[PDB]
Structure formats: C-alpha cells, structure tokens
C-alpha cells in the first residue's frame, strides 16, 4: 500500500480511429502502435 | 511422511545389497579384483538413498500425520494458507543463458568467456534469489 | 527351416559358433513362443469392443488379481532362469583358455586397419617350430634424471612411472600381415586346429568380429591394465575358405573400412604359407604360391575417395 | 435458463499475450507445453538426421555423405533423440499433468522448473551447435567411448560443445527431478495418500530418483572427459582403467538413462488403459512395486552393455538383466489385464497405447536375447541391437508419448485432436516403423556392424537396407499428419466444454476444466481411491469399484 | 434438479463437472466449424466498432416472438448496450432487440437492414451465412457510444 | 542395385501408402454434426451466442446486480 | 489496498508451514545434495580406478602430500561446519545478527580452507605433480578441485544469503534459506572428510 495510483494527461494528436484498437494493443492511445500490414508485406 | 521415507529406505536396502555383492563378487571372480568404479558408484548411490531416506524418516518422526499422508482425510482438513510459490519471473532464463555462456567457454577453451559466464551466473543467481526480498528504493 | 528361424545368423564354422547358434535358436524359439502368446492375448482382448448391446452398465471393474499376478510373476522367473542356466553353460565355452593353443595370432588393430602377427605355432601332431619375435617391444619410460626444474622433481612418468606414449603393451612378430588401406588384410589360419587370438589396439578401442565365428571381442588399447581379457581362443575351424571379418566398435571416421578376412586353409597349405612368408614374400605372394586367391574374395578395399560425387 | 457462449472459442489470442509469458512463465502447465513443443522440434531435427543416414545407407556407395558426416549423424541423432527429445519430455509431461494428477496448484519450486526448461533448451542448442562448426558435430558415437573422445582422437570443437551441451542439459534434468520428487513428497491433495496417487505420478517419482542417481555421474564423467581433453588430465588414459572406467561411468548413467526414458511413459500408457478399458488399472499396487523394482534393479545392471569388452563380471550383470526383465513382464501383463474384459474403445490414445504394447514386446523379447552374453557376442554392436532399442524406445517414447499427447491435448488446450487424422498418423507410424526396423534384426544378425557409413555391394543385405529406408520415409511422412493435426487443432478443432473429453477418466486431472485454471483447480473432490475423477463423475460406481475390486 | 444424463456431477463448489464418451463431442452445434468461426469473428471484432455486445439466438422463440426476444436479450451479460438477433426456423421468424444504451446510435435505422440481410440469406437457405450478414450490417450501422 | 529403382521406391512407397491411408481414414464421416438444413426442423437446443466484446466493469460476478433488461428497441421479420 | 488482500507480513513466506508439514526447501536441497553425492561418486570412481591401476606406489615419487597443511585445513572445515550449525540454531530463533555473525565467521573459515587448498596446490605444482604431469596428480586435482569449486559455491551462497538477510526482515522463509545453505555446507564438509580419509590416510 506504499504506492499512489498514477494519473496522467498525455497531449494527444491520426485520431487512432482507423487502425489499431485498445482491445488488440492495450496502449494504442499512448504511442505509435500499428504499422500498415502492407508495409510488412512489401 | 512414512511411505515417503520407506520408499528411500527400501531403495537404500537394495542398493546396499547390490554394492556389497558387487564388491565381493568383483574382489573375487574378476580379472583385476574390485572394479572400483561400479563398486564406488553403487556405494554412493546407496549413500544417496540413505541420506534422502534418513532425512525423510527424521521428518516423518518429527511430523504428525498430515492430511496428505492421512487416509480418510477431507479436503477442508488441508484447506488453508499454502505457502509462497514464485509467480512470473524472468531470472531463470538469464541463469540458463549465463550458464550456457560458461559452458561454451569451457567447451571452446576460452578462459575469458568462462570468467564472463561465471560472473553472469553469479549475477543471475543473485537476481533470482533476491527477486522477492529486494526492498523498495529508498531514494 | 533352421536358417530362416535363425533370423539371419550365419551357420557357424567353429564348435563354439555352432553351440552359440544352437543357444540362439533355442532362445529365439522361447522368445517367439512368448511373443505369440502375448500378441494372442492382445488381439483377443481387442475382441472386447464396446458392444452396442452394452447398456448403461460398466465392465466388471475388477483389477487386483493376486493369484494371477503370482502365477505370471513366477513363470517369467522360471523361463529366465532356464535361459540363464543355458546361457551359463554356453558361456563356459566362450574362452576355454586351453594352455596349449595350436596357433596363436597376435591381432593388433590400429586406426582403420588390422595387423596379424602369428605369435606362435605349435601343432599337436608335431610341427611348426615357430615363435614370436619381441625384440621391438621397447618402452618409453620418461625417467630423465631431471626435468624443467633444477632438482628434486626427478620425474619418472605419469602412469605407473611411464608415459601414455608407451606402446609396450603391443606385441610384434616376425610375420606381420599388415593391412593397407588399398589391400584388405587376409589372416590365413590352418583348418581343424585350435586358434588363439591375442587382441590389442594400437590407438583406440574397436572390435574384432568374424560374423561366421558368431563371436566378437573388443580390442582395447591396454586390456591388461584395463582388466580386459583380450586374448580368446577358438577350439577349431571346420569349414575352409574365406570368411569376412569386420570392425564392430567405433574407430573414427573410417570405422566402416576396417574389413579383413580370415582365410581358413588346410594344415599343409598353412605349412607352405608360413614357410613362404619366412622366405621374403608378401601375403598375396604367399597365397598365390599356395594357389589361393591373393586378394580378399569376400570384400574389397573399396574406394579411398570420400564418396561418389567427389570430383575424383 | 440459457448461457451466452461464443459461437466458437478464441482461436489464438490477442497480439502479444504469449511471448512475455514464455520468458517469465512460472506456470508448469505452460512450461510443460514449452517442453512438448520444443522436444518435438528436436524430434523432427533429430529424426531428419536419420533420413540422411537412411538415404545414404540405401545403397552400398557413399552417394552424398562422407564417413565423418555420417558419423556425426548418428552421434547427434542418438544424442538429440535421447537427451534432447526423450529425457526432457518426461519432465515435459511431468510438468504438464503431475501437479494436476496430485491435486497440487504448482510444482515445488516453479522458478526452478522454469530454469530446468531453459537449461534444457540452451544446453541442447549448444550441443547441436557443433554442426555449424567447420569440423562438424561430435563424430564419436552417442556413447562416446573413452580414447576416441580424447583430445588425440576427435580433436574438433564440435566434440567439446557436445560434452558441455550435455552438462548444461544434464543440470536442467537434475533440477527437474528435484521439483517432481519434492512436489510429490510435499505438495499433495489433502486426501491423496502416497498409495492413492496415480501410477503416472508414481512412475515420475521413481524416475526422478533415477535421474538424481544417474545424471550427476554423467556430469562428473563429462567433466572428467572435458578435463582430459583440455588439460591432459590422464583421467581416461587407456593405461589406467580409462577405457573401462568411462564405460563403467557412462553406462552406470546410461542404463538408468534408458529407464528414466521408459518408466514415465509406462505411466502414460498405464493412465490411458483404465480410462478407455472402463475399469481400474489392473493391479495398481503391483505396478507401483514393479516400477520401484525396475528402478532399483536398473542401477545395478548397468554393465550389460559391456559384454563384448570382456572386462566385467559377466555372470553378475546377466543375472540381474534377467531379473530386471521380470518386473517389466509384470507391468506388461498388468496392462493386458486392464484391457481384459473391458469395454475397449480404440480412440487415438488407445490406438497408440496398444501400438506401444505390440512394438515394445518385440523389442523387449529381443532385449533378453541381448541379455545373454553368448548371444550378445555375435549380435552386439550390430543392427540387431539398433533394432532392439528402437522397437523399445520408439515403442516406449514415440507411441506412448503420442498417446500422452493425444490423451492430454484437450486437458492442456481445450481442443480435441482430430480422430481421423490421429488414426492416419498412427497407422503411418505403425506401418512405417515395423517396416524400417523389423528387417534390421536380420540386417545385423548377418555381419553388418552398426555405425557403418558404407558397405560393399558384394556384402549381402542390400535389399534390407532399402526396405529400411522405405520404412523410415514412411515414418518421415507420418509426422506430417500429426503436425497438421496439432496445428489445425490447437486453434480450431472440436472444442471440449467439459472435463474428461474421454469419459471414465481417473487421476484427478479430469476433475477440472479441460483448460485447467491457473493453479490447476477451482474444486478438489474428496479423494478416496486411485480413481478420484471416476468416483466423482460416476458416484454410483463408487460402491462397485470397491465390491468388484478384490475378485480380479 | 438433475444433472446431465450420465457422468456429470456437481462439485464441492457450484461448478458442474461433466464428461462425454471418448468418441463424441461437447458443443454439438449443427454448423461447420469454419463458418462458426466466421460468425464468432463477426460478433467479436466486426462489432468492436459498435461497442455494444452483439448476440445471436438461433433457438426457438415462441408465443409472442417480440416478448420472448426481450426476455432472452435479458440473458445477455450487459443488456444495457446489447443487440440480440433471434431467428427461429421452427417459425421462420426473426426478431432483433436492442438495449437502452444502444439507441440512437444508428441501431434503430439498422434494424430493418439487419433483418432484411438475415431474411434474404435464410430464404436462400443459409442460416449461419444470414446470421453473419445480419451481424455485419447491424454492426456497421451502430456507432460507438 | 538399380540406383534409380531404389530412389523411386524410397520416394514413392511412402507416398502411395500415405495416399491409401488418407483415402481410408480422411474420407470417413467426422464426429462434427452435419450442417442444419433449413427445411428440417430445429432439433438442437436453444443457442444463445454473445460477443464478449466489451469490458464488463469488474470481472467478479458479485456487484453486477440486476439493473434491468431496459429494452430499447425491436424488429421483426419472416424471411 | 485497505490493508491487504493477502494477510501476510512478508511478500515472501515459507513454501509450506514447516511446523506441521515438511519444509519444502529443505526437502529439495536434501535431494539435490543426495545428487551431488553421486557427482562426487563419479570423481571417487575415477580416483579409485587410477589408484587400482597404480603399480604399488600410488602417489608417484615426485608427489608428496603435505599432510601437515592438509590436517589444519580439514580441522578448519570441521570448525566451519560446527559454527554453521550454531548459525542455524540462531536462524531457528529470530537472531538475525547472531545468524549473521555465525555465517560470517563460517564464510571466513571456509575462505581460509580454500586459500590453504590453493597453497597446497601451488606447492604440489612446483614440486612436479600437476594435472597433465601424472595420473595421480590429475585424479587428485580433479577430485579436490571440484570439491574446492563446491566450497567456493558454498561461500558464494553464504555471502548471498547474508546480503539477503541485510535487505528484508528475518522470517521463517529466510531462516529456512539459512538452514538449506547450512545443509549444503555440511554436505561439503562431509565429502571433504571422505576425500581426506581417501587421499591422505587410505592413500
Ligand atoms: C529470442 C528469445 C530468446 C532470447 C534469449 C536471450 C534471453 C535473455 C534476455 C532476456 C532477459 C531479460 C528479460 O527477460 O526481460 C526482462 C525485461 C522486462 O522486465 P519487467 O518485469 O516486465 O519490468 C517491469 C518493471 O520494469 C519492473 O519490474 P522489475 O521489478 O522486475 O525490475 C526490472 C527488471 C528488468 O531488468 C532487465 O531488463 C535486465 C535485462 C537483462 C538482459 C540480459 C541480456 C543477456 C544477453 C541475451 C542476448 C539475446 O528487474 C531488474 O532485474 C533490474 C536490474 C537489472 C539486472 C541486470 C542483470 C544482468 C544479468 C547478467 C547475467 C549474465 C547473463 C549473460 C548470459 O525485459 C526487458 O525489458 C529487456 C528486453 C530483453 C533483453 C534483450 C537482450 C538482447
Ligand atoms: C532465432 C531466435 C529468435 C527468436 C525466434 C525466431 C522467430 C521469432 C518468433 C517469435 C517467437 C515466439 O515465441 O513468439 C511467438 C510468435 C507469436 O507471437 P505471440 O506474442 O506468441 O502472439 C500471441 C498469440 O497470438 C496468442 O497466444 P497463443 O498462446 O495462442 O499462441 C499460439 C500458439 C502457441 O501456443 C502456445 O501456447 C505455445 C507455447 C509453447 C510453444 C513454444 C515453446 C518454445 C519456447 C522457447 C523459446 C520461445 C521464447 O499456438 C499454436 O498455434 C501452436 C501450434 C503448434 C504447432 C505444431 C506443433 C507440433 O510466433 C510466431 O508468430 C513465430 C513462430 C515462433 C516460433 C517459430 C520459429 C522457430 C523456427 C521454426 C520452427 C522450429 C523447428 C525446428 C527448426
Ligand atoms: C555442478 C553444478 C552446481 C549446481 C548447484 C545448484 C543446484 C542446487 C539445486 C538444489 C538445491 C535446492 C533448490 O531447490 O535450489 C533453490 C534454487 C531454486 O529456486 P526456486 O526454484 O525458484 O525456489 C525457491 C527456492 O526453493 C528457495 O530456496 P533458496 O532460493 O533460498 O536457495 C537456497 C540456496 C539453495 O541451496 C543450494 O542450492 C546450495 C548451493 C550449493 C551449490 C554450490 C555450487 C557447487 C558447484 C561448483 C563446482 C562445479 O540458495 C542460496 O542462497 C545459495 C546459492 C549459491 C549457489 C552458488 C552457485 C555458483 C556456481 C558457480 C561457482 C563458481 C566456482 C566454479 C569455477 O536454486 C538455486 O538457487 C541454485 C541456482 C542454480 C545454479 C546452477 C549453476 C549453473
Ligand atoms: C569497475 C568499478 C566497479 C564499481 C562498483 C562499486 C562498488 C562499491 C560501491 C558501492 C558500495 C557501497 O556504497 O556500500 C555502502 C553500502 C551502504 O548502504 P546500505 O543501505 O548499508 O546498503 C547498500 C544499499 O544502499 C542498500 O542495499 P540493501 O541494504 O538492500 O542490501 C543489498 C545487498 C545486495 O547486493 C548484492 O548484490 C550482494 C550480493 C553480492 C554478490 C554475491 C557473490 C559474490 C562472490 C563472493 C565470493 C565468494 C568466494 O547489497 C549489499 O551487500 C550492500 C552493500 C553495498 C555494496 C554491495 C557490494 C557490491 O553498504 C555498506 O554498508 C557497506 C558495504 C561495503 C561493500 C563494498 C564493496 C564493493 C566493492 C568495493 C570496490 C569498488 C569496486 C572496484 C572495482
Ligand atoms: C526404453 C529404452 C529401453 C528399455 C526398456 C530396455 C530394456 C531392456 N534392455 Fe536395453 N537398451 C536400450 C534401451 C532400452 N532397453 C538402449 C538405448 C541400448 C543401447 C544400445 C547400445 O549402446 O549397446 C540398450 C542396450 C541393451 C543391451 C546391449 C546390447 C549390445 O550392446 O550388444 C542389452 C543386453 O545386452 C539390453 C537389454 C535389455 C533388457 C534385458 C531389457 C528388459 O529390461 C525389458 C525389455 C525386455 C522384455 C523381455 C520385456 C517383455 C517381458 C515380458 C513380455 C515378460 C515375459 C517375457 C519374458 C520373461 C522373456 N539393452
Ligand atoms: C529416442 C531415441 C531414438 C528415436 C526416436 C530414433 C528414431 C530413428 N532412428 Fe535411431 N538411434 C537411436 C535413438 C533413436 N532413434 C540411438 C540411441 C542410436 C544409436 C546411436 C549410436 O550408437 O551412436 C540410433 C541409431 C540409429 C541408426 C544406426 C546409425 C548407425 O549406426 O549407422 C539408424 C539407422 O538407420 C537409426 C534410424 C532411426 C530411424 C529411421 C528413426 C525414426 O523412427 C525417426 C523418425 C524420423 C523423423 C520423425 C524425421 C521426419 C521429419 C522430417 C523429415 C521433418 C524435418 C523438419 C525439421 C527438421 C524442422 N537410428
Ligand atoms: C568444465 C571445466 C573444464 C573441464 C573440467 C575441469 C575440472 C577441474 C576442476 C578443478 C581444478 C582446480 C585446480 C587446478 C590447479 C591444480 C594444478 C594444475 O592443474 O597443474 C598446473 C596445470 C598446468 O600444468 P603444465 O602446463 O603441465 O605446467 C606445469 C608447470 N610446471 O594447470 C592447469 O592446466 C589447470 C587449469 C584448469 C582450470 C579449470 C577451470 C574450471 C572452471 C570452469 C567453470 C565452470 C564451467 C561450467 C561448464 C558447464
Ligand atoms: Cu570398427
Ligand atoms: Cu579400429
Ligand atoms: Cu541396459
């Protein structure tokens, strides 16, 4: 119990609405989280 | 732990008999007397089983019958606080890698790599052992 | 029927080989009887399918049959004890160690070929005033008065005061039938006589096995120091002709290229061969002189080339 | 009055939910899965080495292999299959179900068994890594006899990597033995007495003791060899008892090694017969004594692999070699008794389990033939011995392990392996196996010593070798149905929403959700007999299992 | 109260541990595994956009179809934002029900579209394909809360 | 002996046996129930399927309570 | 985080309550020591085979065992075992600092044993006998130096356990850790007694 729950306001800016989702990558909103599969295929 | 001790007691009896008969029938009826390899191996596996069985017997006499060792024991009897079992840990793989480094250093006779692998083994074993005792950072 | 039931065991050429083959036939008969009954049990309990007529009623659920367990743990002991008694009586004639061998062959096996010395020959009928040489058994005692240090060490040697590079255990003889990589060695032995083999290895363990002797031994580097009874005897060799022999323990890379021959010839042929070898001649020359093919007829010294696809 | 379940269970899982577990997993169930997957990878890698040997040996010439390349193949094939597939997978199965089968949540030291797996994996890799070196892997045989392994003979680095790779892998096996033996002794269900824990857990327990007795000797011997190779320590100098010292040291480990490889899968086979025969394991108390006797005898009958050396007390080891065959006979008869008068249903676990009986017996029957020194003389170090221990190993640690995999795939994945593909895999394996090795008895009976890279066309038994190669490639393709079955059944395939996909299960591992909850249980039944799960699922049988028991 | 006809027992806790004879299966769903997987994939990630739990009820829904649809939607874990499409081929009937939270997000406008998508495929003779198509159309219609 | 013959044998006998065994076994009716034909009546028990798509507050069952069905829509159709 | 979901003072506790049930760590360490006994069995087999194959004069002429130095180190190892047992007695109690004192002096005396073994090693080496120099020298060095490596590992375990006692509150788990370390040290001294009787007295 010698710990304090953290809370953070990260300045956001693509709107992560076409791509990866928190269900697939839990921290999608926290950073670059998805590379187009076309990039990996090519 | 009566049966647990008795298993090793039986193994010790058999291995002692095997060592004695091997030693006798090799001291006589062999090309060069006692073999001194099979004899020693049999004697010290008798010692293996003897040590384990003696400890188990000490424990059995020191312990009252557990639910595990007690026929006709209900689950609620043993229900209670089980002890600490280590959750997830990534120190075992580091220990294995350090020992592998030391092993390749021994195979390819590289004393520098042997020293590095031994240092890494010390570090990784220290990490594993201290994993659940390292206190919080004091700043 | 015996040949087929022997599972590809060559018909022996020695009394020991014949006796071993008979024991093998008996043991295989016993093993096949046991296997037949057990396979019958398995294929008969495979008739206990889950019959659709089986209603909501589980099987007899018995387990735990003490008398049956006792019977089936008594009978295997009887079977294996009979087999052990037969094994012991056959083993007794594995090395009779007759102190009067009729011909002694010093078989020294080095890395990837053989050499045969003809240590001694003493025919019972009376012949062959022959003997081994042994002037060349020279030791390698590293008993220098002083080593690197100034004094005190006076090192004698690592092992029993000698050096591992000793080779004194090896024995050498006047007539050496050394086998070259391109010439398969052909140890020639008289038929009908008792042949002792004194077995040794120059470098590494390997195994002298004449498949038609129905017997192999492991030529070790220092059998006497390893408590190994390298020397072993054969009471007789009835059939004449060339018999292949092979290496049957790991020698190195060319472990499969150590094949040799044990050509059994008549006693008069052996007389002529040994006389012609005492006279300056090679093994092939002596064989040709006694009118027998010089080169190993059961095997060839096959290609020294590493393989087929190597560009010559 | 109805549940909202997904149309199909989750196939694979979210991105990045597994990689970090493998690194940090302290769960025996996942570690056992890692063992099984990795062990099978070494089976395929080690098995591929035999196909190269098979292709080369199909014809008298040296078509594509060299003498030393072939020599490295059976060294590493024998090494990989035994020490990197057969011995590491007993603790793979132990970690898989042994805590489940005793009611425990985890193993005694679960960070230690994680270390054991990684010691196995990395130790195995450095041994196989002798191949990438220019010289090659260890050229000497798997037995690695003394003078041939000295620095003078086989001086390459691959031989050394092999020695140390076994030392690293050996430690993991020793530590794994400490967990299983400590887990059984200490961690057990509140009602599971030592004489009521399943036969497989008992078999692993005694196997662990054999591991502790045997493997440390190997590590001592390997270091002695490594000291001899790197320091000229004269430890195995032939002028000493070196040649017979190593054989005494190695086989004292070796023969227990071939029994720690055997006893665990006797338990697996013993776990599968009662569930599919719908009756108790015939003679439970006898099997545990038989297992105990085998382990006790295996230690003192080590030298029957050294009959040809002519340097051992020949009668002594033969007698105990005939004495250790009797307990294995009792075990074999008990398995038939379990099958006797039972409602047998030959699903893919029984199919493999019965195959073990057929293949093991013939290999076993040849085993006693080898126990006779006079017969062992001619047949020693020949392909008859190669045929012996393959009918016994493959029977014991391929047929049984596959039976264990097929039997316990639902209990670790929640999915059922396809029965049709399993039957195809078995018969390909069964037909393939008997083809490759049955003729090898005749092959070696007539003169053909093993570890022969090439043979003359004039030498007979050229037709047998091709027949053997045909069988091995039937075995080669037999692993395709299995890998396909597992590949398309791990993520797809008939899900099991119930305990005991094979009804009438025992051993208390069938008393929990087929994918077991972390810590193995949400419900521990009242353990009364050797069949807790059966007692739970069929309470009406509880009285009958006591009444009909004694009659036998 | 009675457990399954054979081999299923109530454990010390609530969970019932069941068994099946070795040959047979557990789910017994009368659909191919692959199109079951397809419908599961739809329900799972083709609905993540909707952020409302999509459910499919193939069972019969008799008497007043609408009301039975309501009280089977009640069984969805969170009916507040849930979309239950129920088809009874015993009655050739389709009924879609929505939770209070999933309302005004295009769900009401997507109901005829989803029902028509289901109906076309059903009259074509493909229950699972029709369910998948209806789920896809409805999930496209719904917007995240 | 007949290098080509031996190669063809070792390469083909496994393939022929595999094909035969696959025909014998893989062509057997599986345990999976046959697809439900629309014409036949619905004999299977009622099936309710759910996405498990969202996060359901706390994982533990207790505390969820029963807020209510709160039905907020409807539809109908007859194929 | 009201107080704790797990009502335990220590994040790390015994693996099972040792008062009623076996100490799991003790069981494991005892089994592992029983295995190390077989490791030393292999070493003993090597030594005894070399002794048997020696031609009467088992220690070659160049080698001369310095029993005058080998007896003090053996007595020091016995004393190390005794003081380690005293440290165990402290560990059974909550005597953190008593355990630390006993184990520190145990470590010091084990280090003295290692240094004395090294001194005898260099003395023997300069007096001819070396691993490549003789079969006796090689078997003796193999056995005694593998025991020395085990003693070094024991010293490492001692210092590691002391560091662990320095970083967390003493608990039954940590007392058990001390107990198993003491088991290892006792096994090491017992195998040393065996090796001493075999090398220096039996010869
Ligand atoms: C391909 C797959 C096979 C790979 C084979 C290689 C295996 C070895 C590499 C993995 C070992 C590290 C690991 O598993 O990741 C832990 C770590 C995650 O730890 P976490 O528990 O989730 O941390 C959460 C919080 O930070 C708080 O969590 P925390 O409380 O547990 O603390 C953070 C954790 C995190 O600590 C670390 O990250 C240490 C990283 C050690 C890397 C060792 C490299 C070995 C070379 C491998 C070559 C490949 O704790 C510490 O230990 C910090 C102290 C640092 C100790 C450094 C010890 C060096 C030991 C050297 C021994 C000699 C071995 C030679 C062989 O993973 C990483 O972040 C590092 C990435 C992996 C390293 C790649 C190496 C290249
Ligand atoms: C060079 C070394 C560098 C690293 C290795 C190179 C490749 C990098 C790939 C990443 C490695 C990895 O473990 O990440 C998993 C990675 C997937 O990432 P993830 O985080 O696991 O994703 C979570 C899953 O979606 C969801 O989780 P999940 O638990 O469902 O995982 C799915 C998977 C696995 O299910 C499991 O739970 C398996 C757990 C144990 C299996 C692996 C044990 C090995 C652990 C030792 C080292 C790994 C660290 O289930 C299967 O579908 C298994 C099919 C069985 C095949 C038939 C076997 C007979 O796998 C890959 O996509 C690559 C394959 C990984 C290994 C294959 C490459 C090795 C060489 C080929 C075969 C070797 C044979 C001999 C030659
Ligand atoms: C030969 C190869 C040597 C193998 C030696 C390791 C095998 C011992 C395993 C059985 C012992 C009982 C046990 O389960 O270990 C607990 C523990 C496993 O922890 P866990 O599974 O997570 O469960 C919690 C423990 O039960 C909770 O108990 P714990 O964590 O508190 O364990 C207590 C003692 C556990 O008791 C012991 O293990 C006694 C330590 C004696 C080993 C000394 C090495 C002798 C070999 C040197 C000659 C080669 O832990 C210590 O505080 C002392 C550890 C000192 C290890 C020093 C190894 C350094 C080797 C390099 C030496 C350099 C000189 C050569 C040049 O194992 C270890 O800590 C040993 C690490 C493995 C080292 C392998 C080296 C490669
Ligand atoms: C290249 C250059 C290398 C530079 C490395 C710097 C090393 C020395 C500086 C740090 C020492 C320090 O600040 O100590 C004061 C520090 C004061 O803070 P504390 O709160 O009392 O505890 C330390 C932590 O703050 C709080 O830690 P804790 O109380 O939680 O306990 C953790 C424990 C755990 O730390 C460990 O890792 C201990 C296990 C050591 C490895 C065991 C195997 C080693 C092989 C043994 C051989 C057997 C034969 O650490 C200690 O043992 C504490 C002593 C601190 C130094 C550690 C020794 C390194 O500790 C002391 O009371 C005095 C200890 C003096 C020992 C220092 C000796 C180390 C080498 C000196 C020469 C420098 C390297 C030259 C090359
Ligand atoms: C799982 C592995 C396994 C198992 C169970 C066995 C079991 C046995 N082995 Fe095995 N053996 C090996 C693996 C195994 N072996 C290996 C890997 C080698 C290496 C080859 C080498 O390097 O030399 C080897 C080598 C080997 C040799 C040396 C061959 C040689 O080098 O020339 C010999 C005997 O000489 C032998 C004997 C036996 C015997 C008597 C049994 C028996 O204990 C059990 C099997 C026999 C039975 C008979 C069981 C069936 C019994 C009944 C059905 C009861 C009724 C029947 C009778 C009473 C006959 N084995
Ligand atoms: C577990 C132990 C085990 C197993 C399973 C096997 C399996 C097989 N063994 Fe085994 N074998 C031994 C242990 C084992 N062997 C031992 C211990 C020796 C003695 C070694 C010595 O004396 O030094 C030996 C010796 C031995 C020899 C004698 C070598 C010689 O002396 O020259 C031969 C010859 O054919 C042989 C053949 C086979 C075959 C054909 C199989 C088959 O059953 C194997 C099945 C094959 C596969 C499963 C491969 C198919 C898969 C693929 C082709 C896919 C590859 C994919 C990847 C690599 C990713 N073995
Ligand atoms: C496996 C290790 C490798 C194989 C196994 C080795 C086991 C040995 C164990 C302990 C030995 C310690 C005592 C050694 C000291 C005894 C004296 C002596 O040895 O004699 C002097 C010689 C020179 O002799 P010289 O040239 O003829 O010149 C004479 C001058 N007149 O030094 C030497 O070679 C000795 C050097 C040996 C160093 C060994 C270090 C081992 C550390 C390995 C770490 C763990 C590896 C893990 C592997 C998985
Ligand atoms: Cu050879
Ligand atoms: Cu040779
Ligand atoms: Cu054996």
Numbering used by the authors:
A (entry chain J): 1 to 13, 22 to 50
B (entry chain Z): 1 to 139
C (entry chain K): 27 to 338
D (entry chain L): 10 to 561
E (entry chain b): 13 to 157
F (entry chain a): 1 to 79
G (entry chain X): 1 to 203
Q: Which sentences from the paper describe this structure?
A:
LpqE was observed in one previous structural study of CIII2CIV2 from M. smegmatis but was absent in another, presumably due to depletion of the subunit during purification of the supercomplex. Where LpqE was missing, the cyt. cc domain exhibits the open conformation, while complexes with LpqE show only the closed conformation of cyt. cc. Clashes between LpqE and the open conformation of cyt. cc suggest that LpqE prevents the open conformation. The closed conformation creates a direct electronic connection between heme cII of CIII and CuA of CIV.
In mycobacterial electron transport chains, CIII2CIV2 replaces canonical CIII and CIV, transferring electrons from the intermediate carrier menaquinol to the final acceptor, molecular oxygen, while simultaneously transferring protons across the inner membrane to power ATP synthesis. Each CIII contains two sites where redox reactions with MQ occur: a QP site near the positive (periplasmic) side of the membrane where MQH2 is oxidized and a QN site near the negative (cytoplasmic) side of the membrane where MQ is reduced.
